[PDB]
Amino acid sequence: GMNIVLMGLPGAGKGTLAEKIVEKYGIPHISTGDMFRAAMKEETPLGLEAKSYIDKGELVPDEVTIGIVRERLSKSDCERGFLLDGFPRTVAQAEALEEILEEMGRPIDYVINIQVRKEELMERLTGRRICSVCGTTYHLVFNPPKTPGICDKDGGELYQRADDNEETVTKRLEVNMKQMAPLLAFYDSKEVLVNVNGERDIEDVFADVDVILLEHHH
Numbered sequence: 001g002m003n004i005v006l007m008g009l010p011g012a013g014k015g016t017l018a019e020k021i022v023e024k025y026g027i028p029h030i031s032t033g034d035m036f037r038a039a040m041k042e043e044t045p046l047g048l049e050a051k052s053y054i055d056k057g058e059l060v061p062d063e064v065t066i067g068i069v070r071e072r073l074s075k076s077d078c079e080r081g082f083l084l085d086g087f088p089r090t091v092a093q094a095e096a097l098e099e100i101l102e103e104m105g106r107p108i109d110y111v112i113n114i115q116v117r118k119e120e121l122m123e124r125l126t127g128r129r130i131c132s133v134c135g136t137t138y139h140l141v142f143n144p145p146k147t148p149g150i151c152d153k154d155g156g157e158l159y160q161r162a163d164d165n166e167e168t169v170t171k172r173l174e175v176n177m178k179q180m181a182p183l184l185a186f187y188d189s190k191e192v193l194v195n196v197n198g199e200r201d202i203e204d205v206f207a208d209v210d211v212i213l214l215e216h217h218h
């Protein structure tokens with residue numbers, strides 16, 4: 001039941017770590033990328049407009065993104081704790097989150113930053129593949145399918161997501177590296193920032209996060 005933000009550049013492993021943390025601790029995963037993808041699959045106006053930002057590797061504007069996050073954090077589950085992933089991405093979003101959480105009386109406990117050098121991030125994102133049937137994630141180096149091009153579960157054809165090609169990855173890295181040092185400083189000045197080396201086996205990265213949360217459990 002903690003209030004945790006996972007920070008990291010695109011490809012750092014936030015979603016992968018978040019599944020392990022939700023599995024074990026039961027707090028809801030709040031991912032702005034998953035909320036925009038849900039809205040896009042439902043073909044809402046906001047989801048289709050968000051797609052132009054997502055496919056070009058740019059940030060959706062602050063005002064609409066803050067509004068969706070504010071609405072989701074207002075739900076009863078988030079009163080127990082939450083794992084934010086992908087938000088905040090600009091200092092304006094982080095200031096907005098401070099005002100939202102101040103109103104809720106729910107200060108952030110940790111901001112866990114997962115550090116991975118950009119050269120590794122480019123390989124992590126460009127080699128990801130997604131199942132067109134079930135949406136399961138594969139990685140051509142780190143987590144390959146049994147057979148190339150095909151999902152192990154259902155026979156679905158794998159694809160590269162629109163924003164994981166090298167041109168879009170380069171833009172995503174540029175756009176988020178610009179915001180990274182101001183956001184890290186914001187949270188290090190608040191004394192909630194923990195840096196974790198993400199260039200390791202997922203189980204090792206997870207153990208270094210888990211040992212923090214288990215300290216609170218005990």
Ligand SMILES: Nc1ncnc2c1ncn2[C@@H]1O[C@H](COP(=O)(O)OP(=O)(O)OP(=O)(O)OP(=O)(O)OP(=O)(O)OC[C@H]2O[C@@H](n3cnc4c(N)ncnc43)[C@H](O)[C@@H]2O)[C@@H](O)[C@H]1O
Pocket residue numbers: 008009010011012013014015016017032033034036053054055057058059060061065085086087088089093124125127128129137138139142143172198199200201202205
């Ligand atoms: N707040 C906001 N404001 C404005 N716009 C916003 C917004 N939030 C979202 N958006 C918009 O939505 C877009 C997408 O955003 P968002 O969905 O937040 O995506 P992201 O964080 O850029 O990056 P990924 O989700 O691609 O990375 P991840 O850190 O979760 O890595 P993962 O575990 O998946 O792993 C990646 C790969 O690496 C592999 N991997 C993971 N861990 C390891 C490891 N330890 N070793 C080797 N491989 C690993 C995985 O198998 C996988 O293939 C944005 O570009 C923007 O357009």
Ligand SMILES: [Zn+2]
Pocket residue numbers: 131132133134135136151152153154155156
């Ligand atoms: Zn599948």
